[PDB]
Symmetry: D2
Subunit: 372 residues, 4 copies
C-alpha cells in the first residue's frame, strides 16, 4: 500500500526526511507501507521546483495549503521553522491527514496545546520528530531499563553541547529570533534531551533552571538582537522520585553534536554519547567483582531495530538511520491503525516542560511541570 507524502520545507530537515522516505523500505522489508514523495512545498515556486528535483518529489508547490486540500495526500510532513508548525498541523488535522511535525512542536506551550487539541480526538497518527531516541543505542538503553537490568533509576544527567554558533561573527538566523523559534538552545536542542529523559526515566515533576545568553547580537550578513537563550541548565525532579539535570549550549568549543546521557540505577549504570552513537556503555553491578565495569556495546542485529539495519555491529549508524527508523515506526502506526511515540501529546508535554524551565529561570525558583 502506498502513502502519498506532502513535505513542507526543503531545507536541512527536508533533506533528511526525503532520505528517510527514499530508504526506509530498503531497510525495513517488507515495509509497513510504501512512501511516495508526492509533493514538496517551499517558500516560492523556484525554491519548490528545485527541492522537487533534488529530493525526488513528483510535484512541487509554493503554497502548502494546496497539499492540505489535496485529497490524495495521506501524510503531511512539517519541516518548516517553528513559527509555521501549528498553523500547518491544525489545517492538516482538520483535513484528516496523518502528521509528522519537526521539534519543537511549536514556539510555546500554548501554541503546542492548540496542535494537540487539533489531533487528540481524530483517528490520525500524529508524531513529533524526536529522532534521537531512535538511535539504536538509546533504544537498547530503554530495553535494559525495562527489563530491570540496572534496577531502579536514581539519577539522570543529560547534555546537548554544540559550537556551530560559538563565534560571535556567525550570522543571525531564525534560530536566534524569539518571534520565529520561540526559544534558543532550550527549544532547539534541550528538547531532544528532555524527550530522551521522558523516554528512559519518566515524567518530570519539577524543574529549576538558569538561562544564559552569551552572544546578544549577531551580524545580519549591521547587527540584530539575539533575544533567546544560548544555554540552559536545569535540575529536575522526576515523578518516580529520581533526580537529574539537563544542560544544553551552542557555546561549547570542541563539542559538535554532543547529546549524551548518564543514568545511575540501583543495579547498574548506562552512558551514551551520540558523537559515538554506535556505542552504548553499560555497567552491571552483578559482574564478578574482579571484572566489573562499563561494557562498550556496539549496536547491530542483536539489539533493538537491528533486523532493519546493517548485518554486523559497527558497520556504522549515521543521522539518516535514525530518520529511517522514525519513518518506519510512523508508517507502521499508520498501517496498523495505532499511535506512535512520541506523539503531539509528547510534543505538548515537552513544550510545557520548556515553559516551566523559562518561568523557573525568570523567577529563580522551582516550578512544577503541569501534566497531560
Amino acid at each position: 500500500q502506498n502513502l502519498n507524502v506532502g513535505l513542507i520545507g526543503g531545507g536541512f530537515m527536508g533533506k533528511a526526511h526525503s532520505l528517510a522516505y527514499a530508504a526506509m523500505p530498503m531497510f525495513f522489508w517488507p515495509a509497513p507501507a510504501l512512501p511516495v514523495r508526492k509533493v514538496i512545498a517551499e517558500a516560492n515556486p523556484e525554491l519548490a521546483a528545485e527541492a522537487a528535483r533534488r529530493f525526488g518529489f513528483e510535484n512541487s508547490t509554493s503554497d502548502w495549503r494546496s497539499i492540505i486540500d489535496d485529497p490524495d495526500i495521506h501524510v503531511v510532513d512539517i519541516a518548516t521553522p517553528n513559527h509555521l508548525h501549528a498553523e500547518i498541523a491544525i489545517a492538516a488535522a482538520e483535513a484528516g491527514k496523518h502528521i509528522i511535525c519537526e521539534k519543537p512542536l511549536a514556539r510555546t506551550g500554548e501554541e503546542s496545546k492548540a496542535m494537540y487539541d487539533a489531533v487528540k480526538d481524530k483517528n490520525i497518527v500524529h508524531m513529533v520528530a524526536f529522532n534521537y531516541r531512535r538511535t539504536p543505542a538509546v533504544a537498547l538503553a530503554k530495553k535494559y531499563i525495562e527489563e530491570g537490568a540496572i534496577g531502579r533509576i536514581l539519577s539522570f544527567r543529560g547534555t546537548y553541547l554544540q559550537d556551530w554558533s560559538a563565534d560571535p561573527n556567525s550570522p543571525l538566523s531564525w534560530r536566534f529570533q524569539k518571534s520565529i523559534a520561540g526559544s534558543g538552545a532550550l527549544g532547539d536542542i534541550a528538547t531532544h534531551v528532555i524527550d530522551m529523559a521522558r523516554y528512559l526515566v519518566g515524567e518530570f515533576s519539577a524543574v529549576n533552571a538558569v538561562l544564559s545568553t552569551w552572544i546578544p547580537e549577531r551580524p545580519l550578513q549591521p547587527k540584530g538582537p539575539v533575544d533567546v537563550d544560548d544555554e540552559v541548565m536545569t535540575m529536575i525532579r522526576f515523578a518516580n522520585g529520581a533526580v537529574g539535570s539537563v544542560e544544553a549550549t551552542r557555546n561549547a568549543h570542541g563539542r559538535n553534536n554532543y547529546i549524551t546521557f548518564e543514568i545511575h540505577g540501583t543495579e547498574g549504570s548506562i552512558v551514551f554519547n551520540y558523537e559515538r552513537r554506535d556505542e552504548l556503555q553499560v555497567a552491571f553491578a552483578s559482574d564478578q567483582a574482579d571484572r566489573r565495569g562499563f561494557r562498550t556495546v556496539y549496536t547491530g542485529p542483536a539489539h533493538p531495530y537491528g533486523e532493519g539495519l546493517w548485518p554486523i555491529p559497527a558497520l556504522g549508524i549515521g543521522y539518516g538511520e535514525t530518520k529511517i527508523i522514525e519513518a518506519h515506526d510512523f508508517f507502521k502506526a499508520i498501517a496498523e491503525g495505532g499511535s506512535v511515540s512520541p506523539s503531539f501529546a509528547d510534543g505538548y508535554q515537552v513544550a510545557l516542560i520548556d515553559d516551566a524551565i523559562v518561568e523557573s529561570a525568570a523567577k529563580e525558583s522551582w516550578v512544577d511541570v503541569p501534566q497531560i
Copy 2:
C-alpha cells in the same frame, strides 16, 4: 540533467547499500553530476529478482544478468554478486561498452583480475572497484593532511581489519569460507580494504612477508570444510621506503568492524578507527611543547566531501554515506568523461598483492609485488 540507467546485479547486502547510494546521492551532492535511475536489478531467480526490485525501488527485474549487458539503454553495470561472477560479468559489460562498478575483491585470483583489467583498460568507459572505506570523510581528511605535507614524510603504517562475526565455530559455511567461490577468506574479504587504504595514503607496495591462519577448519552447512584463511598478518616494504604491516581476522572477540590505521610521519601521526568513523586523530609535531598530542577531529563541512554531507560535524556518518560518496565520484567521472580511483587498475594491483601474500606465506619469505 543527465539521467543514467543502472543495471545492478545482486540484491543481497551490497545490493541494499548500492541501492541506497543510488536513491540518496543526488539529495546529498546537489546539483548532482548525473541522476541515477534504478532501471533493472538482476537476481538468482525471478521471484528473488522481483522482490528485490520492489524492496530497492527498481523499475524492472530479471533472473538473467546477460539481459542487462545486452540492453542498449543500460549505461551503468553494478556488480554486487559473490566473487565467482565478478570477472564474467565485468568482461561482458566491458565488451558492451558499459560503465562498470564492481564490488571487491575484483575477482578470486590475480589471473582472473588481470582478465578484467585487460577488458576495460583500452575502452573509453569508467571502471571502478568498490573500496568505499577510503571515502570515509576521516580517511579523505587523512589524505589531505598527508598530501599537504602536514605530517611530513611517512615512515611507517599499521593497518587492521578485525572482525568476530564468524568467531563462533557454529557459524555456518557460507560462500565466504569456500575458496572456489571466494578465492580467499579474511585476505580477500577484508584485508583488501586495508591494502587499498595503505596504497591510497602511503603508496605502492614493493614487497610483503606474511602468515595466513585458519583457526576454525570446518563449519556446519547452510558439516563441511573451510579451505580459506581466517586471519592474515603481513609485513610490507613500500616502494617509497616506508615500512608497515596489515593484520585482518574473523576471530577477534569484541572487534566488530575494526578497520584502523596508524601512520607515523616525520612531522606528525594519524590514527583512524572506523568503529568511530566520524573521528580522525592527528598529532602535529609543530604544536607548542605544553599542548602537544592527538587532536580528535570530527568530520563535517570543513573537511573533504563535507559540502555534500551533514551541516555540522558529528551529526553522524554511517556506512551509507561512504557508498553515497563512492556513487557521487563514479557518476562525476562518467559525466565528465574522466576516470575514477580506485579503478580496475587498482583492483588488479590489490589482487597481485593478495597473490604475493599467499606466495609469501607458503614459502615463508619476502615476495616482491608484481606491478600491473
Copy 3:
C-alpha cells in the same frame, strides 16, 4: 634544613602522607626542606607503634597532644576523621606550628570558622589538603586559563562519582554518621570539586542544591545513615560564569570519577581523574579543518614536570599529587610564604557547603557568605 613532622592518623591518608614525606625530595631536588617523619599519633599505643614501623616514623604516641607540646615539631599534619580536625588544628596554631589539615576542613562552617580564626592573624603556613588540584593536568588547565588561551570562562561542569558504597550491605563507617563526618558525599568528595572550581574559575556567589540519601541504613544489626549519598548544585560564580557540581557514592561503574568541563569564549578544557595523565583541550584558534579536543599527556613540559617523570605518560598515580602537595607546603614554610589552598580556602568551602545544605532544605538559591 629539616622540618620535623607530627602526623596524626595512620589510616589511608596517614599512608599517602607518609609516602609524600618519604618521596618528596627524591622528586623535587634540591628540596625546599627535608621532611623528618618524627612522631606519628594513633588511637592507641599498639596501633601507633605499628604505624611508626610501617611508615618509618622516629616515634609513635597514642596522645596527639604530645605532638602539639613537643617543641621539636615544626609541622602538624592532621589525617584523622573530620570530628577532630578543629580541636587539633586550634591547639597546633596556639603552639605556633605549621599545619596541613585533611579535607573537609571541619564538620560545619562554624567549626571551620574557629580554625580559620586561630590562624588568620598568624603567619604560620596553613594548608587544606585538596590534593587533586595539584594533579599536573589540573595545574596545566590553570596555566591555559591564566594565559587567556581559552578566553573568558562562561560555564563550569564538575563531578565526583563513586560507587564504593553503592551496595546496601556496605557497612556504617564514620563517613555515614553526621556526628563524625558533618555530611556525606558533599563534605567528603564534592569539596574536592568545589576547590577545583574555585581554583580554575573563581569565587561562588550563589548555589541552588538538591541532596539525596538512597541507602538509609547499613550493617554496623544495622544503623541509620543520616548524611547525603549524593549532591547536585547549580552555581553562580562571582565573575558571572555559571556552573554545576554533582557528587555521589551511588554510581555503578564510576570509581574515582572526579572530572570537570570548562567552556571559555576561545576554547574548552576537560579533565578525568580516572585517566589523570591526560588533559583534553580544544582551542577555537585551530585551523578550521583540524580543530577539536587534543589529548595532552603531562610531562616535563607541563607544570610541576621538572620534579616528576622524565617522559609524559610514564604515569602519575595518587601519590604524585600528595608529593606535589608536600613540596609546595614545605616551600611555603621554608620561604616564609603562604600556600593555596589555605584554611581561608578551607573555610570558604565550608561556607559553600553550609549554603548548599541550606539551599537544599529551603529549595531556593542561597548567597554564599564571603569570609
Copy 4:
C-alpha cells in the same frame, strides 16, 4: 629483618628504585623485609654524595667494587647503562649477593649468557627489572588467561611506541650508541613487550623482523653516528602455536609511553594501554548477545596486588607503584628463600629473542629462537 641495598647508578632508574625501597613497606605490610638504602655508587664522588642526599642513602662511593666487597651488603641493584650490567652482576654473584639488574640484561645474548651462568648455580635471588608486567592491569590479564576465561590464545599484538627522540636534534646519548646500549628500540623498549608476550602467551618459537633507523646522526652531548635501530617490527610464531607481532619505535609523534597489547583468545580478547594503565579491557564471548563487548575494568582491591595498593579502583597507579610491586616480590623471595620471575633466566631468554630478531632482520628470514637450556 633488614636488607642492606647497594644501588649502582643514580640516574632516572636510581630515582624510581630509591622510591620503591623507601615506599614498599608502607604499601605491603607486614613487609617481607625492610629495605635499607645503605650505599649508592655513582661515576664520581661528588655525584655519588649528591645522589646519596637526594635519594636518602646512608653512604656513597664512586667505586661500585666497594659495594661488592662490602660483606654487609645483601642486595646489589644495578641501574647503570647496559655496558656495565655484566661485569657488576658477575662480581655480585661471585660475592654471594642478591641481584636486581635493569633491562636489557646486557648488550647481547652472549654477554647475557655470562650473567645467567654466574647466578644459575648460586643460592641467590636474581631479577631483571621488567616492571611493566607488574602493572596491576597486566597481572589481571594474566589471571584471566590462566583461569581459561578467554580460552586458548590465537593471536598476540604488542607495541611500545614513543617519541622522545623523534626530533633529530635530540642528542646522541648512550641509548644511541651500539657499543654502550647494544641495540636501540629493540633492547631499550621492545624487550618490555617481549617480556609481556612471554608472561601472557608463552615462549617464542621463531621471529621474522625488520629493523629501521630513521635518524642516522645526532648532535653529540658537531654530530655523531646513530648505529642502532630506531624502530623494530617482528612477526612471531609462539611455541604453543599462537601467532603475533611486536612493534616498537622512538619515532611516533603523539605516542609517549604507549606500551600496549591486544590478545585474541577462542573465548574472548584482552586489550591494555599503559598510557591508561589503570584500565584493562576485556571482551568475553559468553556475554549475552545483546550486551557483549569490551569491559573497561579499573584495577583496585579486587585485582592482583590490590591488597597492597590503593583502597579504591582509579585512585591511580603511576610508574612508582610498578617498582614498589617489583621490590615487594623481590624482597619476598629473599625473605622466603625462594626465587622471583622474571629472573636472569628470563633476561637471558629475552636477549636470545633480541639476537634472533637482529639475525632475522639481517637475513630477511625466519629465525628460530633458542631456549636458554640449549
